[PDB]
Amino acid sequence: SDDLSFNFDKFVPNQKNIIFQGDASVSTTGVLQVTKVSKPTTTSIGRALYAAPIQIWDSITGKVASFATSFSFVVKADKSDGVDGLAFFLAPANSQIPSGSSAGMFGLFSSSDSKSSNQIIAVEFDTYFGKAYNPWDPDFKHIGIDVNSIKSIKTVKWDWRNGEVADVVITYRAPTKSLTVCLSYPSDGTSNIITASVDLKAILPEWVSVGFSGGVGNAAEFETHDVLSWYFTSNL
Amino acid sequence: SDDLSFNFDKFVPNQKNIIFQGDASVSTTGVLQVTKVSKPTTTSIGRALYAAPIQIWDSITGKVASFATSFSFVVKADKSDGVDGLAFFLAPANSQIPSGSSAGMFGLFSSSDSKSSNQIIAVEFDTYFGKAYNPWDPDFKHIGIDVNSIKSIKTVKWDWRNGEVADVVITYRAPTKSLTVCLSYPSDGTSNIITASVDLKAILPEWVSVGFSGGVGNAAEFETHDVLSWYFTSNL
Amino acid sequence: SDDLSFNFDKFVPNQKNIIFQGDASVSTTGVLQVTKVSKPTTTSIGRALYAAPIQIWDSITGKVASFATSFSFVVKADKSDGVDGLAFFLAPANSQIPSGSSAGMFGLFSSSDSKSSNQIIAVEFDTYFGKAYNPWDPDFKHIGIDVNSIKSIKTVKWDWRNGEVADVVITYRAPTKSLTVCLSYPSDGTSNIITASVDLKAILPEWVSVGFSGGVGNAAEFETHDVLSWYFTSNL
Amino acid sequence: SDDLSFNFDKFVPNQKNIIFQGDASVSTTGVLQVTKVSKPTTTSIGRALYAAPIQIWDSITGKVASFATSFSFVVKADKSDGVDGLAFFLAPANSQIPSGSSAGMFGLFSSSDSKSSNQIIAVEFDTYFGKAYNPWDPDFKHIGIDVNSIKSIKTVKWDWRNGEVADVVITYRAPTKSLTVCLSYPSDGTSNIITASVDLKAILPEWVSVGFSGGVGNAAEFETHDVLSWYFTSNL
Ligand SMILES: CC(=O)N[C@@H]1[C@@H](O)[C@H](O[C@@H]2O[C@H](CO)[C@@H](O)[C@H](O)[C@H]2NC(C)=O)[C@@H](CO)O[C@H]1O
Ligand SMILES: CC(=O)N[C@@H]1[C@@H](O)[C@H](O[C@@H]2O[C@H](CO)[C@@H](O)[C@H](O)[C@H]2NC(C)=O)[C@@H](CO)O[C@H]1O
Ligand SMILES: CC(=O)N[C@@H]1[C@@H](O)[C@H](O[C@H]2O[C@H](CO)[C@@H](O)[C@H](O)[C@H]2NC(C)=O)[C@@H](CO)O[C@H]1O
Ligand SMILES: CC(=O)N[C@@H]1[C@@H](O)[C@H](O[C@H]2O[C@H](CO)[C@@H](O)[C@H](O)[C@H]2NC(C)=O)[C@@H](CO)O[C@H]1O
Ligand SMILES: *[C@@H]1O[C@H](CO)[C@@H](O)[C@H](O)[C@H]1NC(C)=O
Ligand SMILES: *[C@@H]1O[C@H](CO)[C@@H](O)[C@H](O)[C@H]1NC(C)=O
Ligand SMILES: [Ca+2]
Ligand SMILES: [Ca+2]
Ligand SMILES: [Ca+2]
Ligand SMILES: [Ca+2]
Ligand SMILES: [Mn+2]
Ligand SMILES: [Mn+2]
Ligand SMILES: [Mn+2]
Ligand SMILES: [Mn+2]
Numbered sequence: 001s002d003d004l005s006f007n008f009d010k011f012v013p014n015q016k017n018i019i020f021q022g023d024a025s026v027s028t029t030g031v032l033q034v035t036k037v038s039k040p041t042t043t044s045i046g047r048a049l050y051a052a053p054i055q056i057w058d059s060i061t062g063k064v065a066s067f068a069t070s071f072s073f074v075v076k077a078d079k080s081d082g083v084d085g086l087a088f089f090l091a092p093a094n095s096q097i098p099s100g101s102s103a104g105m106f107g108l109f110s111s112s113d114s115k116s117s118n119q120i121i122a123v124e125f126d127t128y129f130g131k132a133y134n135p136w137d138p139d140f141k142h143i144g145i146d147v148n149s150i151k152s153i154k155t156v157k158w159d160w161r162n163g164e165v166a167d168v169v170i171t172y173r174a175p176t177k178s179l180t181v182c183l184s185y186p187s188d189g190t191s192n193i194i195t196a197s198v199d200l201k202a203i204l205p206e207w208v209s210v211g212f213s214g215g216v217g218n219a220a221e222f223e224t225h226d227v228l229s230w231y232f233t234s235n236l
Numbered sequence: 237s238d239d240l241s242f243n244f245d246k247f248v249p250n251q252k253n254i255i256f257q258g259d260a261s262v263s264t265t266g267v268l269q270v271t272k273v274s275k276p277t278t279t280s281i282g283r284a285l286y287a288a289p290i291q292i293w294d295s296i297t298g299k300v301a302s303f304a305t306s307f308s309f310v311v312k313a314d315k316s317d318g319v320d321g322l323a324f325f326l327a328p329a330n331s332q333i334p335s336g337s338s339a340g341m342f343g344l345f346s347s348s349d350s351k352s353s354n355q356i357i358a359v360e361f362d363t364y365f366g367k368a369y370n371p372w373d374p375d376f377k378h379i380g381i382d383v384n385s386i387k388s389i390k391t392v393k394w395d396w397r398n399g400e401v402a403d404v405v406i407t408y409r410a411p412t413k414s415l416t417v418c419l420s421y422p423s424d425g426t427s428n429i430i431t432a433s434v435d436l437k438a439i440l441p442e443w444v445s446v447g448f449s450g451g452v453g454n455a456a457e458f459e460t461h462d463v464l465s466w467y468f469t470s471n472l
Numbered sequence: 473s474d475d476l477s478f479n480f481d482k483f484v485p486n487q488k489n490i491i492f493q494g495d496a497s498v499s500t501t502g503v504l505q506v507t508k509v510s511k512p513t514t515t516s517i518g519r520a521l522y523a524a525p526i527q528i529w530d531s532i533t534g535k536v537a538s539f540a541t542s543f544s545f546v547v548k549a550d551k552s553d554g555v556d557g558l559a560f561f562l563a564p565a566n567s568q569i570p571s572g573s574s575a576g577m578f579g580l581f582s583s584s585d586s587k588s589s590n591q592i593i594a595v596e597f598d599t600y601f602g603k604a605y606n607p608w609d610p611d612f613k614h615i616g617i618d619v620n621s622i623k624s625i626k627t628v629k630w631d632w633r634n635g636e637v638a639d640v641v642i643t644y645r646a647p648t649k650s651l652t653v654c655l656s657y658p659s660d661g662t663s664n665i666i667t668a669s670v671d672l673k674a675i676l677p678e679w680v681s682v683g684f685s686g687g688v689g690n691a692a693e694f695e696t697h698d699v700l701s702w703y704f705t706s707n708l
Numbered sequence: 709s710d711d712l713s714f715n716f717d718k719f720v721p722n723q724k725n726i727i728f729q730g731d732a733s734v735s736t737t738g739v740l741q742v743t744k745v746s747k748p749t750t751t752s753i754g755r756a757l758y759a760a761p762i763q764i765w766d767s768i769t770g771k772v773a774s775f776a777t778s779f780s781f782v783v784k785a786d787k788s789d790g791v792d793g794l795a796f797f798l799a800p801a802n803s804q805i806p807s808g809s810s811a812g813m814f815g816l817f818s819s820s821d822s823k824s825s826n827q828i829i830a831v832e833f834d835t836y837f838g839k840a841y842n843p844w845d846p847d848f849k850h851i852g853i854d855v856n857s858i859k860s861i862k863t864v865k866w867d868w869r870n871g872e873v874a875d876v877v878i879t880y881r882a883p884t885k886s887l888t889v890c891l892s893y894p895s896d897g898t899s900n901i902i903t904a905s906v907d908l909k910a911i912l913p914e915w916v917s918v919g920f921s922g923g924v925g926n927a928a929e930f931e932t933h934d935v936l937s938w939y940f941t942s943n944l
Contacts, residue, residue: 001474001939005713012768016761016801016915052760053724060720093724154425169418171405178422182405184431186412189390193429195420207724231709237703237710241477248532252525252565252679288524289488296484329488443488467473626897641890643877650894654877656903658884661862665901667892 002235003065004054009229019211021097022046022107034086034214035225041078042219045097045107048227049211053093054234056208057201064201066174067234069210073227075127076163082127082223086214087146088170089122090200093207103215104134105150112136114149119204122146122213123170123181125158127223143181145196147203156194161185165228172200238471239301240290245465255447257333258282258343270322270450271461277314278455281333281343284463285447289329290470292444293437300437302410303470305446309463311363312399318363318459322450323382324406325358326436329443339451340370341386348372350385355440358382358449359406359417361394363459379417381432383439392430397421401464408436474707475537476526481701491683493569494518494579506558506686507697513550514691517569517579520699521683525565526706528680529673536673538646539706541682545699547599548635554599554695558686559618560642561594562672565679575687576606577622584608586621591676594618594685595642595653597630599695615653617668619675628666633657637700644672710943711773712762717937727919729805730754730815742794742922743933749786750927753805753815756935757919761801762942764916765909772909774882775942777918781935783835784871790835790931794922795854796878797830798908801915811923812842813858820844822857827912830854830921831878831889833866835931851889853904855911864902869893873936880908 010030011018018026023036024046036044057064073086084103091108098110105112108120112135124144129137136151141160144152169182177197184191210232214225246266247254254262259272260282272280293300309322320339327344334346341348344356348371360380365373372387377396380388405418413433420427446468450461482502483490490498495508496518508516529536545558556575563580570582577584580592584607596616601609608623613632616624641654649669656663682704686697718738719726726734731744732754744752765772781794792811799816806818813820816828820843832852837845844859849868852860877890885905892899918940922933 001713001715001941003715005709007709007711012763012766016763050760052758055720055724058720167407167409167414167416169405169407169416171403173403173422176403176422178403178420178425180403180405180418180420180427182416182418182429184414184416184429186409186414186431186433189414189431189433191416191429191431193418193420193427195422195425195427197422197425233709237477237479237705239479241473243473243475248527248530252527286524288522291484291488294484469473639879639881639886639888641877641879641888643875645875645894648875648894650875650892650897652875652877652890652892652899654888654890654901656886656888656901658881658886658903658905661886661903661905663888663901663903665890665892665899667894667897667899669894669897 005233007231017051019049024048032227034212035216041222045215047107047213049209053207053209063236064174065234065236068171070169070231072167072229074165075223077223083221084128084215084217085126086225087122087124088212090208090210091120092205093209103217106215107213109150118148154196159190241469243467253287255285255287260284268463270448271452277458281451283343283449285445289443289445299472300410301470301472304407306405306467308403308465310401311459313459319457320364320451320453321362322461323358323360324448326444326446327356328441329445339453343449345386354384390432395426477705479703489523491521496520504699506684507688513694517687519579519685521681525679525681535708536646537706537708540643542641542703544639544701546637547695549695555693556600556687556689557598558697559594559596560684562680562682563592564677565681575689578687579685581622590620626668631662713941715939725759727757732756740935742920743924749930753923755815755921757917761915761917771944772882773942773944776879778877778939780875780937782873783931785931791929792836792923792925793834794933795830795832796920798916798918799828800913801917811925815921817858826856862904867898
């Protein structure tokens with residue numbers, strides 16, 4: 001079998017194999033709310049990571065791991081629009097929420113620069129793209145591949161369906177250094193896709209930590225960032 | 237673990253766990269050529285299926301299986317255009333090539349009707365769409381979900397890259413009856429996607445056979461239909 | 473993931489991915505009776521194999537596969553003693569029941585010789601050891617590793633529990649060429665174990681077929697040979 | 709797939725997904741030495757656990773997980789005899805080495821009582837059985853199932869082979885509450901086995917931590933406690 005493999009059909013409150021950072025928590029209905037869901041609605045940032053670090057590449061052998069993750073999430077806005085987005089990410093083992101972060105940086109970045117020191121690769125599901133506060137984002141809700149910077153290296157228009165459940169399948173094929181995000185809404189057949197080339201060895205350290213993150217930088221334009229299920233498998 | 241799961245990193249000549257029908261064969265370089273690759277180029281039809289049938293649904297319990305398959309293929313044309321296409325499919329256990337078939341029907345259909353008797357669900361990678369011989373096809377190279385008929389129930393434009401390797405990931409989520417085709421070319425980031433609702437129970441019998449098929453209805457506009465690797469997992 | 477992997481929690485009547493030979497069949501309660509269970513009791517021989525052949529070793533690369541199988545069975549005798557036994561085995565792809573076989577040879581051997589041509593490796597659960605008809609067997613009910621001959625190369629006393637369910641775990645570690653049979657009765661903690669060195673490459677052809685077999689050479693001393701569940705995984 | 713599954717073909721020095729307690733460490737040759745290997749030989753105690761906790765049972769649903777673990781170890785003594793032993797165990801999530809422990813208690817127990825508070829289930833590979841310091845142990849080197857107490861609830865004679873590699877397969881079948889230890893030495897076919905009934909729900913809390921432990925209570929009778937590989941899979 002492969003190096004690592006784990007499935008979560010549902011989450012349980014205060015799960016021991018998940019590290020909660022920020023407002024991230026799991027409701028009694030079994031859903032992981034990376035973003036605080038409360039009345040009244042409050043400004044929030046949260047991240048949830050699998051407790052054990054993953055060896056993503058080996059310095060001794062030069063081998064890079066190929067992984068695949070599948071998960072289902074929901075983003076429900078009270079209004080027609082919402083903020084700020086959700087993100088699946090790989091960061092250095094036991095990464096802490098960068099000091100002075102913000103909802104628009106999904107708790108992954110301290111600023112809008114492209115510093116190789118960040119050592120972060122993430123797939124963002126950006127719901128907010130306004131240029132007043134997010135000048136880097138394009139003119140629409142998007143799915144983006146982020147490498148060491150919140151300014152995605154490649155994006156694609158996200159046909160977001162308010163309150164609808166999305167099935168995401170992300171694959172990473174080490175041999176060809178390609179990353180493929182595969183999103184689809186089973187309710188109405190709406191689906192989006194994006195692929196990009198990335199060399200993990202050249203960006204992340206050997207041992208990383210995987211998980212999700214998100215934010216809400218304005219309680220006025222509230223929306224949830226609930227992940228329902230999560231499958232992950234990696235292999236060197 | 238799941239009911240069934242098999243991986244083929246490469247194929248071997250005259251593989252014992254694969255049923256070859258038509259011109260389907262595997263070259264000494266380890267690639268499954270569902271379509272005959274010869275000099276001079278000849279009209280051809282072929283299908284390759286995994287030897288053991290799969291229980292796709294249970295009449296006793298009403299449960300429907302959820303499956304996922306991943307594979308990589310190449311379609312190389314001598315000219316700029318080619319024929320006829322490739323297809324991944326589920327057919328009744330040990331299905332034979334329908335009598336009087338043709339390249340445009342990928343060896344899966346006897347005619348252009350929508351007969352529930354065909355009991356075939358397939359994902360086509362149609363390279364030929366000319367209305368003179370394929371009146372059902374749209375005005376472009378496409379990826380299509382076929383249900384009991386060669387006239388796809390839903391299609392999407394296929395941004396085919398001649399000679400380039402494509403990575404396909406198809407998923408079937410029984411609970412939501414949705415099928416998602418996820419194609420991408422690692423070489424240039426080009427990717428396509430399609431989702432559709434289908435109830436396997438309502439179309440195929442309990443025991444099916446899975447595999448690939450394709451054809452070339454005109455030696456003049458030759459192209460290969462080579463599948464390089466195949467991963468398959470099913471579960472009730 | 474690995475080359476092959478399949479799980480059967482229960483069997484269904486006339487399962488399509490299992491090849492039935494002899495009196496082998498599956499009752500409506502979901503159990504695979506390799507031996508005929510009828511009133512009145514009749515002399516019988518049966519074998520059940522997984523439909524697809526398995527590549528156990530590669531001539532091109534010299535690599536040998538490591539496999540592991542787990543299953544649960546029951547052997548119920550009307551009297552205190554019973555015949556003839558059960559066997560898990562690896563034989564050439566799509567092997568037929570040897571002409572002129574007998575219950576004591578579990579439908580795997582034509583005679584009592586050690587012919588390398590048999591190309592059979594099997595784990596027997598011998599219930600009958602009488603020297604009048606089975607001169608090769610030791611003085612007790614045994615578990616035996618059979619290589620090209622019904623005269624086991626190594627045996628161990630089997631503490632058979634009439635009607636009780638046995639959990640067997642067999643492992644094959646290619647690197648060290650060792651085979652380990654691990655049997656245990658959850659009801660009363662009774663357990664037996666045996667290990668032996670065997671080189672698959674030196675005995676079986678590249679493509680084999682796996683399954684079970686058994687017999688009853690005397691309806692007077694009847695017993696069942698029912699296998700309840702089966703897990704199998706192989707990898708090159 | 710199952711809830712959790714991880715394979716370690718070899719260990720790397722200062723592995724990030726393993727928690728080292730005591731003298732436990734991993735040499736540059738890639739082997740996990742739970743016991744300190746130094747010149748001169750020194751008194752030692754160590755434990756290594758997988759970083760993420762495992763949900764072994766669910767209070768919400770009453771379901772108990774079934775697990776299986778496979779590993780290979782070596783115990784090499786300079787003399788003909790050695791101390792003290794090795795142990796595979798399940799303890800409360802992130803358990804610390806009990807205060808005032810000793811080599812004979814493999815770093816799992818504070819005393820020789822049977823306190824349900826210990827919440828520990830372990831499989832011991834006891835090399836030392838002298839009654840002067842280990843009055844609970846039987847008159848031979850043994851494999852034992854320990855439940856909340858170092859006084860095994862069931863043991864079996866261990867035919868230890870000095871310096872030889874042992875392949876262990878432990879299985880836990882929740883439905884029948886049975887635990888089966890399956891040990892074998894591929895070098896000379898020597899093998900041992902033990903089964904016992906245990907209800908995890910009645911002993912451990914929902915979230916446990918798994919790993920190995922061992923000790924050496926006398927530098928004079930030194931031996932290694934090296935684990936070479938580890939496979940683990942659990943499922944609710
Ligand atoms: C050069 C030429 O015009 N060749 C003709 C073929 O195109 C034509 O057959 C059809 O080829 C199509 C494209 O490959 C297929 O979609 C179609 O299935 C196939 N038709 C059949 C019956 O095989 C044939 C037949 O009219 O004539 C050739 O001359
Ligand atoms: C050579 C000698 O007699 N050394 C003594 C130790 O044997 C003895 O300690 C005990 O060693 C046993 C065997 O390794 C262990 O089972 C036992 O746990 C351990 N006892 C403790 C408290 O560590 C020690 C202690 O009496 O004295 C040494 O002199
Ligand atoms: C109603 C309103 O204008 N609220 C302001 C809020 O938008 C604004 O900034 C934040 O909100 C956007 C969208 O959610 C995020 O992309 C930004 O990250 C976030 N900025 C920061 C620093 O959190 C704040 C701050 O200017 O002011 C609110 O009044
Ligand atoms: C009651 C009795 O003596 N029946 C005889 C039967 O035992 C005997 O042989 C067979 O039975 C043994 C035990 O089941 C098997 O191990 C042998 O394989 C099997 N022999 C053959 C050729 O099937 C038969 C044949 O001598 O005679 C019965 O009368
Ligand atoms: C179409 O295929 C089916 C199955 O082989 C066959 O019964 C039918 O007659 C075929 N049509 C023609 C025209 O042969
Ligand atoms: C035994 O271990 C427990 C847990 O560390 C501790 O509370 C207890 O006091 C220990 N016994 C002694 C004598 O220290
Ligand atoms: Ca944004
Ligand atoms: Ca066409
Ligand atoms: Ca016999
Ligand atoms: Ca001891
Ligand atoms: Mn963005
Ligand atoms: Mn078409
Ligand atoms: Mn025998
Ligand atoms: Mn002991």
